Structure formats: C-alpha cells, structure tokens
Paper text:
Approximately two months later, the BA.2 subvariant, known for its heightened transmissibility, replaced BA.1 and spread worldwide. In addition to 12 common mutations with BA.1, BA.2 has 4 distinct ones—S371F, T376A, D405N, and R408S—on the RBD. The structures of the ACE2-PD-bound trimeric S proteins from BA.2, BA.3, and BA.5 were determined at overall resolutions of 3.3 Å, 3.4 Å, and 2.8 Å, respectively. In contrast, all three RBDs are “up” in BA.2-SA and BA.5-SA. Therefore, three ACE2-PD molecules are bound to the trimeric BA.2/5 S protein. In BA.2-S, however, the mutation R408S disrupts the interaction with the backbone carbonyl groups. In addition, D405N is less favored by the nearby amide groups in the neighboring protomer (bottom right). Scrutiny of the local environment suggests that the shift of the N343-glycan in BA.2-SA and BA.5-SA is a direct consequence of the mutation S371F, which is found in BA.2, BA.3, and BA.5, but not BA. Notably, this shift would result in a clash with the antibody S309, making the binding less favored.
Here we report the cryo-EM structures of the trimeric S proteins from the BA.1, BA.2, BA.3, and BA.4/BA.5 subvariants, with BA.4 and BA.5 sharing the same S protein mutations, each in complex with the surface receptor ACE2. The five sublineages of Omicron exhibit numerous mutations in the S protein, which is responsible for receptor recognition and facilitates fusion with host cells. The RBD may exhibit “up” and “down” conformations in reference to the viral surface, and only the “up” RBD can expose the binding site which is responsible for mediating the interaction with the peptidase domain (PD) of ACE2. This interaction triggers the conformational changes of the trimeric S protein to further expose the fusion peptide in S2, which then facilitates membrane fusion with host cells.
Author numbering:
A (entry chain B): 735 to 826, 854 to 939, 944 to 1027
B (entry chain A): 979 to 1124
C (entry chain A): 27 to 66, 81 to 140, 153 to 172, 187 to 210, 215 to 247, 264 to 621, 640 to 676, 690 to 734
D (entry chain C): 540 to 588
E (entry chain C): 735 to 783
C-alpha cells in the first residue's frame, strides 16, 4: 500500500492544496490496490481451505509399512512443520510505502495441509465427497492400481516390495532439495518494484531541484508552483506505472492460484 | 474562461494543460478496461468449458461440477452471465464392518471382481463400494490368482 | 452555560436543485453534538459566523447589532422587525449602552450616511455568516430546553453590504406595563436529499469514529464489514538545532586592546581568517561613543558569512570622526584614509583620553596634511618627501614654499571634547570567491532522545526519533545512509556518538462495524501502530492495535477478518477480537481391518454463478 | 446554444416535471451535471437533453 | 526490443544528457520487454518438447 500524499508531496503542506487540483488520482490508486489486497487472501483460501474438519492421524502411525514421517508434522517442534516443509522455507518501510500482513498465518496453513494428509491416508478420496469412510491403506493402494488398469493382486502379493521401494523413492526427494526459483521470482519482482518506486523520488524531471522545500527556500511562489507542479506530475506518473504493473502481475499469480486449487 | 481572458499566444499554453490532463485520464480509463476485459474472457472460457463438460456430459473431475458425485446439470441464463444448477450424489449413513483383502479356499486366494469382502460379525459377503448391498461369496463374483 | 445541540445548524449550502443524490459538501456549519452557550446583555465575539436559536411564542428578540466597534465614527448593521416586517439597514449609528403609550425604539440616536435601506411553543432559527462582504441569513420558523430533530434552513436575504463584523449584541423587549449562541466551523457533511429536493438527513464527518466513515462511502447506511477510512500519523515535538563548538574565537581581543596604536598616516591592518566570529563581544562590549554599520545591520553580524574581514585601527582628533564615512572630505579623510562609496564594513570609534593623553604633549601620532592629489580608497601612503607648492624645485630643504608634510597632534588631558584623542577601528568584509569561510557562531539546543522531534545536525535536516546506535563509522564520516540512499544515522558533532533515525509512526486507520442495522458500536484498528504511540479495551495484534473490542479465549468461525489469524464478531452486546477457527476436529476410527460403507444416500443440488460478459462502451 | 444568466450549455429544452424549492435556479443529476434550469422570466423548469 | 536512447533522442548529445534527469526509466523499459521475450521461447518448448 502506498500513501499517495506522502509519496508525492512528502511532509510539506503547501503541496497538499496543489495535489487536490489534479482530481481523484489518489482515490483511484487506493481503490486499485485494495482490489489486489483482497484477492490475494482469497487466492490462498481457494487453494488450501478445501477441508471442513481438521483431521488427525492415529498415534501409532504405522500404515501397513509405508512410512510417511517425512511428510507428516514433527511433534518435537514449535512450528509443527514436516521435515520437508522445513527445507522448503529455508530456500526462499519507506517514504509512504507499507507492507500488510497476510490474513492466514503459516501455522494455519500448516493445519490445512496436515488435515488433507490425514484425510487421504486414512480415507482416500471419500472425505471430499461426503463423510470420511475408513479403509485400510494397503487396500486403498490396491484400488488405485485398479483405476489405472492393473489387476489388484499385483499389490496384495507384493505389498512389502512396493512399500519398501516407495519409502526409498520418497526419501530421495530431500536429497534433490538439500527448484524453488518460481517462488523466489515472486519475491524478487515485488522487491524490485518497491526499490525502483523509491529511487524515482531522486529525479528532477527538468525542474530546478528535486526537493519541494528547497524550491521555496530559493524561489518565489509564482515560479515555485510551476516547479512543484512538474515534480508532482512526474511522481504521479510513477504511481500510475507501479499500480498498472501490479494489476497485470496479480492476474498472473491469480491464474497460478487457480491451477493450484484445481 | 481560457479563451476569454487570454490572448491567443497565452491561451494555447492553458489549453495544452487541459488536453494533457484529460488525455491522461482517458488513456488510463481505456488501459484499465483492457486489463478487466482479459478477466471476463477467462471467465467466459470457464463457463464454456463447464457448459460442455457439466451439461452435455458427466464429469469425473473433482469439485468441477459441484460437490459430490456428478449426476447432471441444468443451465439458467442471467443478465450478464450464466447460472448452473448442479445435481450431485452424496452418500449418507455409514456403518462399520470388518474386511479382508482376499479369501482363502482350497489353498487358493480369491479376490473380488468388482467389490469388497465384508464381515457382519459372523458371515462374509461381497458389497459394492458406494452402496451397501451384500451378496453371497460365490465363484461368479470372484476370481482366483495364486 | 453550555447546552448539547443534536443535529442543528444545517442550511442549504447553495442554490442548485438535486434529487435523490447523497451529495457531499464542505462549508461552515454548526458541528453536530456541539457545546452551545446559553443566555437568559454583554457584547459577544463573532470570529466566524453565528448560530442563533430561540424558543418563545411571543417576540422577545427585537433585532441584532453587528459590526467591528459597535459604536459611532464607523458604519454598522442594524436589523429590526416591528409588527410590520424585517428592516435591514446599514448606517453609522450611536447605540445606547442599554438599548430596548406603547412607544419604543430607544436603541440608537443617530443614523448617518445610510448605504442600504429596506422596508416591507415556537422555534425560530437563524444562521448568520459574512463572506466576501456578503452578510447571509438563513432562517426557518417551525412550531412545536430545545427538543431533538432535523430541519434544514433556507436562504432569507442576500445583502451586498461590505461590512466587517467581529462582535455583535442582541435586543430584547422589556416588561414595563431565552436564546442560544453557537458559532460555525469548517466541516464536511454527507447530505441526503429526498425526491422533492429537500435535505432530510445528514452525517457529520470528522466527528465520531464511525461517521468518519459515512463520509468515505458516501452513504448513510453502512453494510457490515471493515472499512479503511483514514490514517494515523504521529507528530514531532520541539525543534532542536545541534552544531559543533567553536575551536577558535579568532581573537578580536588584541586588535581592540593593542597598547600601542598606529598614527593615521601609517595605519595598521589586520586580516581575519577562517575562524569563529562572535561580535557579541562588541555590541555589548565597552561604553562606546560612535558605532555605525553601513553594509549590514549591527545585529545580523552573527547569521551571515564573509570571506575576508579586514580590520583597520588608528587614532584621530575628536571632531574628525565625522570623516571616517563613505564620501566625505577634510584634511584627514582626504589623504590619510579614504573609505569608498560602496562601503560594506562597520565603523566603531570611542574616546581614549585617559590612556593616550599624557601631560606636556605626546608627539608620537602624526597626520599628513600636504599631498599632490587625494588618495584612493583603501590605499596607503607613508612617504616623507618634502612638499612643493611654489614654482621653484625644493631640493629637499624646508623653508619658503617647501614644507614638511607631517605634523603631530598634542592631546594634553586638559582639552575639550573634539580635541582629545579618539581611537577608531573599522571592519570591512569582502566575499571574493571562497565557497565558505568564517561565519557567525552557532546557537546549539541540547538534544533529547526517544522522542519524535524536528532535528538539524549542522545542515542535515530531518524528522524522526533519535536512538543510541550500534554502528561504527570511520574516523572521518559524519552520517550514514541505508540502501536506496536515505540518511539513517548521524553523529552528534559535540559528543561524537552515533544515533539512529526512524520516522514517526504513521499508518492507516480502519473502522470495524457490525452494520448500522445491528448496532452503532465500533472498534478501531491502528495499522502497525504500537499501543504506546496511539494518542478500556486495548488488544495488540500483529496487524496493529485494536481498541474498543474485548479479546476472548474461545474460538469462533471468522466473521469480519482482521488479519494474522484474528477476526471480529458482534456476539457477546459488544465488539470483540479473537483468533479464527479453521474448523471442527474429526478423529477417524482407523484400524488395519475396518471399513465404513454407506447404507443410504441423498441427492443434493447446488448452484454456481459465473459472469460471461460486460458492457460495450 | 443557450445561456441562462451565466449557465452556458448546449442541448434541447423541454418542459420538465421536476419541482424545485422556492429558492433554487437549476440542478445537477447524479455525477453533478446540469440537467434542468428555471427560466428567469417565466419561472418554469425545463429539462436539457 | 526498442533502444530508448535511439527512439527518444536519435544521435543527439544535448538530448542524451537530458535523459539523465529522468532516472531509471530505460532500466524499466529494457527489463519489461526482456522479461516477456524470454517467456516466448518457454512457450514453444512447453508445447513441442
Ligand atoms: C521412517 O523413516 C525414518 C527415516 O526417514 C526412520 O527414522 C530413522 O530411523 C533410523 C533407523 O532405521 C535412525 O537411524 C534414524 O535416526 C531415524 N531418524 C529419525 C529422524 O529419527 C523411521 O524409523 C521410519 N519409521 C518406521 C516406522 O520405519
Ligand atoms: C449376518 O447376516 C446374516 C444374514 O442376514 C445373519 O444370519 C441370518 O440371521 C437370520 C436372523 O436375522 C436367520 O434367520 C438366518 O438363519 C441367519 N442365517 C444363517 C446362515 O445363519 C447373521 O445373524 C448376521 N450376523 C450378525 C452378527 O448380525
Ligand atoms: C583588554 O585588556 C584589559 C587590560 O589589559 C583586560 O582587562 C583585565 O580585566 C579583567 C576583568 O576585570 C581583570 O581580571 C584583569 O586583571 C585585567 N587585566 C589586567 C592586566 O589587570 C581586558 O580583559 C582585555 N579585553 C578582553 C576582551 O579580554
Ligand atoms: C565540544 O565542547 C564540549 C564542551 O562544551 C566538550 O565536552 C567535553 O567532553 C569531554 C569528553 O570528550 C569531557 O571530559 C568534558 O568534561 C566535556 N566538557 C564539558 C564542559 O562538558 C566536547 O568534548 C567538545 N567536542 C569536541 C569534538 O572537542
Ligand atoms: C466405528 O466404530 C468405532 C469404534 O471401533 C466408532 O468410533 C468410536 O466412537 C465412540 C463414540 O461412539 C468414541 O467415543 C470413540 O472414541 C471412537 N473411537 C475412535 C478410535 O475414534 C465409530 O463411531 C464407528 N463408526 C460408525 C460410522 O458407526
Ligand atoms: C434413506 O433415507 C431416506 C431419508 O433421507 C429415508 O426416507 C425417509 O423415510 C422416513 C421414514 O419412513 C420418512 O418419514 C421420510 O419421508 C422419508 N424421506 C423421503 C425423502 O422420502 C429412507 O427410508 C432411507 N432408506 C432406508 C433403506 O433406510
Ligand atoms: C418579469 O416580467 C414579466 C413581464 O415582462 C412578467 O410576466 C408576467 O407574468 C405574470 C404571471 O407571473 C402574468 O400574469 C403577466 O401577464 C406577465 N406580464 C406580461 C407582460 O406578460 C414576469 O412575471 C416577471 N417575472 C418576475 C419574476 O417578476
Ligand atoms: C459541553 O462540552 C464540554 C466539553 O467541551 C463538557 O465538559 C460539558 O459537560 C458539555 N456540556 C453539556 C451540557 O453537555
Ligand atoms: C417599522 O420600523 C421601521 C424602522 O424603524 C420604520 O421605518 C417603520 O415606519 C416602522 N413601522 C411602523 C408602523 O412604525
Ligand atoms: C460617511 O461619513 C464618513 C465620516 O464619518 C465619511 O468619511 C464618508 O465619506 C461618509 N459617507 C458618505 C457616503 O458620505
Ligand atoms: C476587514 O478587516 C480586515 C482586517 O481584519 C481588512 O483587511 C479588510 O479589508 C476588512 N474588510 C472590509 C470590507 O473593510
Ligand atoms: C414531498 O415528498 C413527499 C414524500 O416525502 C411526497 O409524498 C410529496 O408528493 C412531495 N411533494 C411534492 C410537492 O412533490
Ligand atoms: C435490517 O433491518 C430490517 C428492518 O429495516 C430488519 O427486518 C432486518 O432484520 C435487519 N437485518 C439485520 C441483519 O438485523
Ligand atoms: C511498544 O513499545 C514498547 C516499549 O515502549 C515495547 O515493549 C513493545 O513491545 C512495543 N510493541 C510492539 C507491538 O512492538
Ligand atoms: C486466556 O487463557 C490464558 C491462559 O491460557 C490466561 O492467562 C488469560 O488470562 C485468559 N484470558 C482471558 C481473557 O480470560
Ligand atoms: C495390524 O495392526 C497392528 C497394530 O494395530 C500391528 O501390530 C499388526 O502388525 C498389524 N497386522 C498386520 C498383518 O500388518
């Protein structure tokens, strides 16, 4: 969120009466940025908040062999993240600019993910269409092979082999991590727009100076109104560029959130 | 007021200020419509996809044609859009039973052809997975392997 | 006294018609729920307009008096209304100090130079204002301590008078055989018009924490939710200007105390350099007799800056000090010392009889009184060539037409004023090309901490809170900047300590409302403001400070989202804050040989709405 | 092309069905554009399409 | 791609020095056009490869 008056004018009060003479440009900026701010929380709810109840796994945590400890939460942590989630988060104020916090904390998101994991491992896909119906996991895997055209005895006669091979295959995932460039790019693109927006305040745009107080200190009002009006136009153009790009870039992350929710 | 209290060489300067301001505002207006126009088009493409896949067919895609198991959908028109009426199948009133992956008989392993083996406490039956309807375990609804 | 208005003093801001249009206007009104004085009389102030209500079936109020002096010798306004009709009049009056058969009108006794004439229970309201020489009156008479309701007032007159007003009085009908006074302030309202074009309701903006809203949405009905309406900005106090010390005074103390001055014909010349110059030694130094400053004023010697400060000193006779000045003549100023016509220096001159006045004649100080032609400004001539006035060359022998060019004063203590030796010093500045040089001395200002202040550190101008730092500058660096090149630390010139700088503490202000159809209670969130810097129920969240809602330990479904897991609801009424509930808690009875199978089902029907088109423009 | 004591504009003048207050000269639709005036001489409200 | 200097000034030293008073507008212009030019090769790899 950008404070239009503090970005353009900046502290000065003689400027505020001049900025009012350009109409509702500062109202448009606030409305446009609020639209983005509301959609970004909805994007997250649609991807993760697809479960009614918060499911938990049973204490034993032994599902016919298959070992899921690398994707289930670690009870010996303040954050209750999984071992793989701990790796995933280890790789990625100014002149009127502020950053608002998300509505959902990352603890709350972790609770949606653990509910999806606990629902699936114990009831497969039945809880997404109604009540959760328990079935042993080994039998869940056998139905899944049947869905791809493999006869179900292939699992039941080879249950140990598939469970042991799976456990190593999932174990290799950490080695490939210890990738997330698509997540760092989102951070970089916004950091670059905020670093550029601030740097554009040190530009004269063809005026005598770039500071709205220094103009007055060494110039009469009749001519100072012209010099300040040039700087206002230049910095107002900066805000229009910034907000237009945030709308175009927010449509791209929204399309990605729709794919992730799907 | 600009063409009445200024000479021509002085009024041109003031007209350019109005043209610049009003042109900037009008050019902003049209750019914002291009940005919104891409969004309504994307929504219309989703509505067209659901029209084929939810109304002219039966979809298996999860949470694409309502919540539950898709049976059928009916369209209704709206002023600037479309309303879909989605009819879904939802199971209710479950009970627990006991299961086994296979049955041993004559030293051989029997598997269900299209169901699950269940036990009501004393006898074993075969049911279909989405509706409780027990059948006697026979050689007509099972197959042998191993 | 002070009565509590409710929604009173609302008048039609102008002509123009308007149907169903929640119009927003800025003008001079009586604020809603204001403190209005009560009278049952003395001259009252005006300052900016007046609200005037009253109650009574009879007519006790018999006009008003306005103006600047409320007396004669200047024109004033007088408004009366007998049983006929209102009479506006603007003359020069002479008012009774107590103005009031059935004979009346003992208010004034003079009506000169009239510039305007005109002739032609119960609540009688008036609004008076005076803008650009126009004196407006709104009024309405509505039949029934004042009651409670809304009624907009229509224009009554339009009076191109020109009159200034700063005070006014009232007139009452005595017994021989109750009124209100408010004032107007610049406020903003949101006015509701009916289909007939009249004002039926209004919202005072900049008042309650709520209304601060009705003005942002342009409505009188707000739907449940959370609205960003304004912002919080901490303000700085005090202005501290820090600076260095002095290093060197640049000792005037000698040039103005030299025990052996110089005779005028060969006058000494001391040039100041880059220094600290404190002329407060002088202006408030000795007793002095003459101190005249030509280029700059004697007090502004300590806020300018010049390159080279030349200082001349000598001694001369009493009545000749009138010749050390731009553009003079005489045996001394002609050719001993010539000041130019565009002088910028500062002349000081005093009496020194007791210090350079010895008995029996003190023949040390000479003064030339023969020369070919007059001198050049600031030039110097010390020769001793024998003069030649006649036509025969001298060959360096005194006598006839060959005079020695140097004489000597005397100065015995028994002289009158105008012949005792005076000491004269002159200062002269000149700024050739130097970037900066010796300037005046700097007035410090202490240095406070942990407070938002307006600071200046020897040229560095800014605003913010000063705190002890943990950075280490290099032993030549004054201040530091952050990435993006903004100053974030300075060094105090006097104490040589590094201090961090941080802006005040602004942020948005949002209003949390259950909906005007539920309640008029509200809570306010100051976004990322610490709860110690805001200026009951104060709740600290990662999103700021929430005031006006109670935080409970239960967990509900989210209703109004605040942020960082916190929501608000209208349940327990009042307004509360809390942490959202994601959902219930289900524990599936999992085992390695148990299955659940449905025995029944239901057919469910849901809808989904999707936009397909927009308007073609 | 009309001018009503200062109000300058262009449009078609037609008999209206609005009722001004007895101090109002004209008015402005939503978005604040003049859409009706009163004739100073005859005191009748006219719409300005 | 467009070279901002050639478009705006076109081999003119008086104009080229004046471009220094506007800050980093050309930096934004080059990155905006380059960032979408790289995606165009990605678009064809994802369809055929
Ligand atoms: C699930 O896998 C984890 C490893 O990913 C197992 O935990 C490790 O077990 C080995 C011995 O087999 C120990 O040397 C490691 O110290 C264990 N790691 C940790 C973090 O404790 C775990 O035992 C497996 N679970 C089951 C039921 O086999
Ligand atoms: C499991 O289901 C079977 C079939 O319904 C039950 O066995 C029958 O029970 C009925 C009475 O409900 C008797 O009339 C039949 O003779 C029974 N059949 C046989 C082959 O014995 C059985 O009782 C059920 N088990 C439980 C624990 O309810
Ligand atoms: C100019 O010189 C005089 C005398 O040389 C200084 O006066 C002295 O005054 C102080 C204050 O009363 C005494 O304590 C000293 O004893 C005096 N000096 C002597 C030698 O007795 C005077 O201070 C000098 N001017 C300045 C500005 O310092
Ligand atoms: C500037 O002058 C002040 C005095 O006005 C100096 O303050 C002294 O600082 C030292 C430590 O550096 C202390 O021991 C002294 O007691 C201080 N004097 C007083 C009167 O408080 C300060 O050091 C000077 N600054 C510089 C850079 O020389
Ligand atoms: C399936 O059977 C289980 C027990 O084997 C039932 O789960 C228990 O239900 C009681 C309440 O009736 C709870 O107090 C226990 O804590 C439950 N146990 C566990 C492990 O969660 C369950 O209700 C049965 N399901 C159905 C659909 O009848
Ligand atoms: C399956 O559930 C439905 C209800 O969803 C049962 O039908 C209801 O039966 C009760 C009792 O006879 C009636 O009062 C209701 O009117 C019925 N509802 C409807 C919508 O018809 C039905 O009996 C259940 N089936 C079985 C086999 O138990
Ligand atoms: C302005 O003057 C005209 C006349 O020039 C007035 O017109 C009269 O209007 C009344 C009705 O209001 C009629 O009964 C008269 O017959 C009209 N006179 C003529 C000569 O046509 C008009 O009323 C005046 N306007 C105002 C506001 O006084
Ligand atoms: C009027 O307002 C003052 C504060 O300005 C308050 O102290 C006083 O009680 C008010 N008077 C009434 C009658 O409400
Ligand atoms: C009413 O007062 C005015 C002003 O004093 C005066 O001119 C007028 O004659 C009065 N009318 C009567 C009937 O006295
Ligand atoms: C009114 O009287 C004042 C002197 O009191 C005088 O200056 C002024 O000119 C007079 N006005 C007229 C219109 O005669
Ligand atoms: C009213 O008084 C002000 C000074 O307070 C003065 O400048 C102004 O000219 C006066 N107005 C008139 C109409 O005399
Ligand atoms: C005034 O408004 C009322 C509704 O509040 C309406 O019934 C009435 O007709 C209006 N009067 C006129 C003259 O239009
Ligand atoms: C809103 O007000 C109407 C009456 O005007 C009432 O019937 C309705 O219940 C109210 N809604 C709420 C949520 O209180
Ligand atoms: C507010 O400031 C105090 C110190 O004055 C500090 O203890 C507290 O943690 C601060 N609150 C926040 C939210 O930073
Ligand atoms: C909430 O519970 C905590 C302990 O978990 C307690 O310290 C706190 O006082 C409680 N808050 C309220 C409002 O009762
Ligand atoms: C069944 O689960 C129990 C734990 O509940 C476990 O001890 C046992 O080994 C499992 N049986 C088989 C055949 O996997």
């Amino acid at each position: 969120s950008v404070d239009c008056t503090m970005y353009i004018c900046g502290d000065s009060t003689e400027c505020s009466n001049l900025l009012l003479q350009y109409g509702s440009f500062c109202t448009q900026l606030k409305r446009a940025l609020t639209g983005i701010a509301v959609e970004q929380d909805k994007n997250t709810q649609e991807v993760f908040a697809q479960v009614k109840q918060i499911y938990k796994t049973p204490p034993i945590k032994y599902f016919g062999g298959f070992n899921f400890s690398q994707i289930l939460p670690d009870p010996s942590k303040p954050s209750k993240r999984s071992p793989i989630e701990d790796l995933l988060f280890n790789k990625v104020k100014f002149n009127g600019l502020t950053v608002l916090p998300p509505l959902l904390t990352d603890e709350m998101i972790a609770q949606y993910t653990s509910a999806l994991l606990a629902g699936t491992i114990t009831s497969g896909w039945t809880f997404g269409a109604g009540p959760a119906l328990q079935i042993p996991f080994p039998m869940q895997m056998a139905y899944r092979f049947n869905g791809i055209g493999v006869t179900q005895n292939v699992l039941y006669e080879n249950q140990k082999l598939i469970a042991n091979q799976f456990n190593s295959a999932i174990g290799k995932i950490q080695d490939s991590l210890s990738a997330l460039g698509k997540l760092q790019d989102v951070v970089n693109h916004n950091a670059q727009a905020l670093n550029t927006l601030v740097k554009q305040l040190s530009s004269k745009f063809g005026a005598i100076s770039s500071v709205l107080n220094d103009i007055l200190s060494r110039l009469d009002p009749p001519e100072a109104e012209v010099q300040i009006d040039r700087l206002i136009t230049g910095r107002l153009q900066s805000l229009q560029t910034y907000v237009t790009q945030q709308l175009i870039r927010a449509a791209e992350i929204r399309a990605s959130a729709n794919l992730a929710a799907t | 007021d600009i063409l009445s209290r200024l000479d021509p060489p002085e009024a041109e300067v003031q007209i350019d200020r109005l043209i610049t301001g009003r042109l900037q505002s009008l050019q902003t207006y049209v750019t914002q419509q291009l940005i919104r126009a891409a969004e309504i088009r994307a929504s219309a493409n989703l509505a067209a996809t659901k029209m084929s896949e939810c109304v002219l067919g039966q979809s298996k895609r999860v949470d694409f044609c309502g919540k539950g198991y898709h049976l059928m959908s009916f369209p209704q028109s709206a002023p600037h859009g479309v309303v879909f009426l989605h009819v879904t199948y939802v199971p209710a009133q479950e009970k627990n039973f006991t299961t086994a992956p296979a049955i041993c008989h004559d030293g051989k392993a029997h598997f269900p052809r299209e169901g699950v083996f269940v036990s009501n406490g004393t006898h074993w039956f075969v049911t279909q997975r989405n509706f409780y309807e027990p059948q006697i375990i026979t050689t007509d609804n099972t197959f042998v392997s191993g | 006294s002070y009565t509590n208005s409710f929604t009173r003093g609302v008048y039609y801001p102008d002509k123009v018609f308007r149907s169903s249009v929640l119009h927003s206007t800025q003008d001079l009104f009586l604020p809603f729920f204001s403190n209005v004085t009560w009278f049952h009389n003395p001259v009252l102030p005006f300052n900016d307009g007046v609200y005037f209500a009253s109650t009574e079936k009879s007519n006790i109020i018999r006009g008003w008096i306005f103006g600047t002096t409320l007396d004669s010798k200047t024109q004033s306004l007088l408004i009366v209304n007998n049983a006929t009709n209102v009479v506006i009049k603007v003359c020069e009056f002479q008012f009774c100090n107590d103005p009031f058969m059935e004979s009346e009108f003992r208010v004034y006794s003079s009506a000169n130079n009239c510039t305007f004439e005109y002739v032609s229970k119960n609540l009688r309201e008036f609004v008076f204002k005076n803008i650009d020489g126009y004196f407006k009156i709104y009024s309405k008479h509505t039949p029934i301590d004042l009651p409670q309701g809304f009624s907009a007032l229509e224009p009554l007159v339009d009076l191109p008078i020109g009159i200034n007003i700063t005070r006014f009085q009232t007139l009452l009908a005595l017994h021989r055989s109750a009124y209100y006074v408010g004032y107007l302030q610049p406020r903003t309202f949101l006015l509701k018009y009916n289909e007939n074009g009249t004002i039926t309701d209004a919202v005072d903006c900049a008042l309650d924490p709520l209304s601060e809203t009705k003005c942002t949405l342009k409505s009188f009905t707000v739907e449940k939710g959370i609205y960003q309406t304004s912002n919080f900005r901490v303000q700085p106090t005090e202005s501290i200007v820090r600076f260095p010390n002095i290093t060197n005074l640049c000792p005037f103390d000698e040039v103005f105390n030299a025990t052996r001055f110089a005779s005028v014909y060969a006058w000494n010349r001391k040039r100041i350099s880059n220094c600290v110059a404190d002329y407060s030694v002088l202006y408030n130094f000795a007793p002095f007799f003459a101190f005249k400053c030509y280029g700059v004023s004697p007090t502004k010697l300590n806020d300018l800056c010049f390159t080279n400060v030349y200082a001349d000193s000598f001694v001369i006779r009493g009545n000749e000090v009138s010749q050390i000045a731009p553009g003079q003549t005489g045996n001394i100023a002609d050719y001993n010392y010539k000041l130019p016509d565009d002088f910028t220096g500062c002349v000081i001159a005093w009496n020194s009889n007791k210090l350079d006045s010895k008995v029996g004649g003190n023949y040390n100080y000479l003064y030339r009184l023969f020369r070919k032609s007059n001198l050049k400004p600031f030039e110097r001539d010390i020769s001793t060539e024998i003069y030649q006035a006649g036509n025969k060359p001298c060959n360096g022998v005194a006598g006839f037409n060959c005079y020695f060019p140097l004489r000597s004063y005397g100065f015995r203590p028994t002289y009158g004023v105008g012949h005792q030796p005076y000491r004269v010093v002159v200062l002269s500045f000149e700024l050739l090309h130097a970037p900066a040089t010796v300037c005046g001395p700097k007035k410090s200002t202490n240095l406070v901490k942990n407070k938002c202040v307006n600071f200046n550190f020897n040229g560095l101008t800014g605003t913010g809170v000063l705190t002890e730092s943990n950075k280490k500058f290099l032993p030549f660096q004054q201040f530091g900047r952050d990435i993006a090149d903004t100053t974030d630390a300075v060094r105090d010139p006097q104490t040589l300590e590094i201090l961090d700088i941080t802006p005040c503490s602004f942020g948005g202000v949002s209003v949390i409302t259950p909906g005007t159809n539920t309640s008029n209670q509200v809570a306010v969130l100051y976004q990322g403001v610490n709860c110690t810097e805001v200026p009951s129920n104060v709740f600290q969240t990662r999103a700021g400070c929430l005031i006006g809602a109670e935080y409970v330990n239960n967990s509900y479904e989210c209703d109004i989202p605040i942020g960082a897991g916190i929501c608000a609801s209208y349940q327990t009424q009042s307004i509360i804050a809390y942490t959202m509930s994601l959902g219930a808690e289900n524990s599936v009875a999992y085992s390695n040989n148990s299955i659940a199978i449905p025995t029944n089902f239901t057919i469910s029907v849901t809808t989904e709405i999707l936009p397909v088109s927009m308007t073609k423009t």
